[PDB]
């Protein structure tokens, strides 16, 4: 037999800030 | 027999802020 | 026999903020 | 025998904010 | 025997805000 | 034997806000 | 034997706001 | 034997707001 | 043997607002 | 003194395809 | 002194296809 | 004195494809 | 003195593909 | 004196592919 | 005196692919 | 005296691929 | 006297691949 | 028999700050 | 007098691959 | 007097690979 | 008089591999 159990609680993996992939800027 | 169980609670994987993929700026 | 069980809760994967795919700006 | 069970609760995968695919700005 | 069960509860996958596909602005 | 069961509750997939496909603005 | 069952409850997939396909503005 | 069952409840797929296909404006 | 069942309740696919196909204007 | 001038050329704001406001279907 | 000038050329706002407000099917 | 000038050329803001406001389906 | 000039050339802001506001699918 | 000039050329801000605002799928 | 000039060329800010605002999938 | 000048050439800020704002998947 | 000049050439800030804002997977 | 068990607590793997993948800047 | 000049050449700030803001996976 | 000059050449600040902001995995 | 000149040739500041901000993993 094979078993795998996963539990993510209240506020897992959430974004409350800023995620920027790529930023290019002149002056 | 094979089993896999996953539980995502309340507020898992949510976005409350900013997600920007790509940003280009002149000035 | 094969089983896979998943649960998602109240506010999973929800966007309450801003999602921008691509942004280009001059001045 | 094969089984797969998924449960999405109250407010999963909803948008309550802003989703922008693409944005271009001159100034 | 093959089974797949899905349940979406009260307010899944709904839009309460803004969805913009594409935006172009001169100024 | 094959089965697939899906349930969508009250306000699933509904729009209460604004959906804009494409937007072009001069000023 | 093959079965598929779908249930949409009270207010699925409804529009209570604005859906605009395409918008062009000079000013 | 093949079976398909669909149920749409009260205000499913209804419009209670505005649907605009295309919009062009000078000023 | 092949079967299909579809049920529409009270106000499925009803318009209780405004639908505009195409709109053009100057000032 | 206040002036506003707008010019629309040949096939501006025209439909040469399909515009559907709302669509519902069981199967 | 106040002025507004608007010009429509050949086929502004014309429909050369299909415009459907609302469509409910079934099977 | 105040002036605003806008020019839309041959084929601005036209639809040559498909615009669907809302779409609900089953099985 | 105040001036604002905008020019849209041949095929600006047009749709030649598909624009869907909202899509719900049972299967 | 104040001036702002904008020029959009041949095929600005056009859609030739697919724009989907919202998508909900059971299977 | 104040001046701002912007120029957009042939295929600026156009979509030729797929833009999806929100996607929810059961399986 | 104040001057700003911006130039976008052939194919700036365009999408030729896939932009997905949000994605939730059960399996 | 104040001046700011910006030039974006052929294919600046364009997406030719995949942009995903947020992704949640059960399995 | 093979078993693996994972429990992630209230606030595992969440972001409350700025994530920037790549950054380029002039002067 | 004050001057600022910026030049972005052919393929600056583009995406030709994958940009993922956030990713949550059960298995 | 003050002067600032920036030149980005062919393929500055582009993404040709994978940018992941945040990744969470249960197994 | 104050002067600053910056030049970035080639694919300066580009990503061709994998950028991951944060990575959390079970077994």
Residue carrying the six token digits 């691929």: P17
Distance CA S24, CA S22 (A): 7
Cα angle N10, Q16, O7 (rounded to 5 degrees) comes to 30
Q: Tell me the C-alpha distance between E24 and E27, whole Å.
A: 9
Q: Do N11 and M6 touch (CB under 8 A)?
A: no
Which chains would you list as touching J if contact means 3+ CB atom pairs under 8 Å?
A: G, H, I, K, L
CB contact under 8 A, G10 and H5: no
Q: How far is CA U22 from the centre of its chain?
A: 17
CA E16 to CA F11: how far, in whole Å?
Answer: 11
Residue in M1, M12, M15 nearest the CB of L19: M15
Cβ G18–F19 below 8 Å, yes or no? yes
Structure tokens at R17: 């700050």
Which one, of G17, G7, C7, lies nearest residue I5 by Cα?
Answer: G7
Closest CA to L13 of J20, J21, M16, J18: M16
Picking from N1, N10, N23, the nearest residue to O23 by CB comes out as N23
Residues of L annotated in the binding site for Zn(2+), as ranges?
Answer: 1-2
Probe site for chain U from R13, R18, R23 (most U CB atoms < 10 A): R13
Pairing of strands I18-25, H18-25: parallel
Residues of chain Q contacting S19 with CB distance shorter than 8 Å: 17-20
* Conformational region of residue U10, where left means phi above 0, alpha means psi within -120 to 50, and beta covers everything else: left
Residue J25 in tokens:
């279907």
R1 is annotated as contributing to ligand binding: yes
Q: How far is P11 from chain Q (nearest CA, A)?
A: 5
**How many CB pairs below 8 A link R and T?**
25
Shortest CA gap C19–chain O (Å) = 9
Q: Where are the beta strands (DSSP E) in chain T?
A: 2-8, 18-25
Compute the distance between CA of residue O25 and CA of residue G27 in angstroms, rounded to an integer. 40
Look at H19 and J24 and tell me if their CB atoms are within 8 Å. Answer: no
Residue among L11, O9, G19 at smallest CA distance from M14 = L11
**Taking a C-beta distance cutoff of 8 angstroms, is the pair G26, J6 a contact?**
yes
> N2-27 burial by CB neighbour count: b if 16+ within 10 A, else e?
ebbbbbbbbbbbbbbbbbbbbbbbbb
Nearest to G26 among J6, J19, J22 (CB): J6
Q: Tokens 């600032």 — which residue?
A: T4
The verdict on whether residue U27 carries a ligand-binding annotation is no
Nearest to T27, CA basis, from A7, D10, P19: A7
Kindly determine whether residue P15 and residue E6, on different chains, have CB atoms separated by under 8 Å. no
Q: Which of O2, O14, O27 sits opposite N14 (nearest CB)?
A: O14
**Would you call J12 and H24 a contact, using CB atoms and an 8 Å cutoff?**
yes
Q: What number of C-beta contacts closer than 8 Å exist between A and T?
A: 25
């Amino acid at each position: 037999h094979h078993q795998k159990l996963v539990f993510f609680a209240e506020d897992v993996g959430s974004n409350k800030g800023a995620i920027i992939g790529l930023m290019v800027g002149g002056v």
